[PDB]
Amino acid sequence: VPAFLSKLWTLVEETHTNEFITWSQNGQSFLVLDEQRFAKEILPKYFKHNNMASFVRQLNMYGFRKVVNGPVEFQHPYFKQGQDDLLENIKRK
Amino acid sequence: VPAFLSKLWTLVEETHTNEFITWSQNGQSFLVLDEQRFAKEILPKYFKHNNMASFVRQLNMYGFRKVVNGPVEFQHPYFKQGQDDLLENIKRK
DNA sequence: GGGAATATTCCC
C-alpha cells in the first residue's frame, strides 16, 4: 500500500480532521467539506503540498471517482469504512 | 530553468544561509557546512523535504559533481558565482 | 550515483 492510500485512510478515519474530511453516512465514500480550509490547513500536515488539485490528482491516479462552501464526495470500490483490508486492491494507474 | 536550479542559486547566494551553504572562495563551486543542521533547518525552507540525500539526488540529476562536522563541496561547469546567465546551460539528466 | 517507483506540478 503506497503512502497516499495509508495517509488517505488515516485522514478520513481520524476524528480530529472530520470538520474537513470524513466518511459519508453509508461509509462507501468520503466527503471533503470547506475545501479552501482543507487544503490550506489539513493537506500540508499529511502531504508535501497545500493544493486541492494535487490531492485530487492523486485520487484520480488511484481510480477514485467523484460522486455527483460546498461538500465534495469521492469513492473507490475498495475504499470502504471498516474494511481497510481492501486497500491492497487499489491500484495506481 | 527548473525550480531546483533557481532555488539552489538563491540558496548559495543568499547571505542568511552562508553558515550552511555558500560559494567557495574561487566562486567555481559551493560548500555545504554542518550538513546535519543544513538538512534539518535549511532544506525544508526551500524544498519539500529535509533529507540531504534528496538534495544530493537533485545535484546528481543536474550533473553536479562532488569535489574531493566537515564541509562538502560540489561543482558544475555552468554553476559559477556572478554568472547566473550560465544556469540555462545546465541540463537535467 | 543512478534507475525506477511514487509524489507533485504543470498544462491540455
Added chain:
DNA sequence: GGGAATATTCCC
C-alpha cells in the same frame, strides 16, 4: 481527468 515534466523516495 490524465499525460508528461520535475521532485522526492526507495533501493541497488
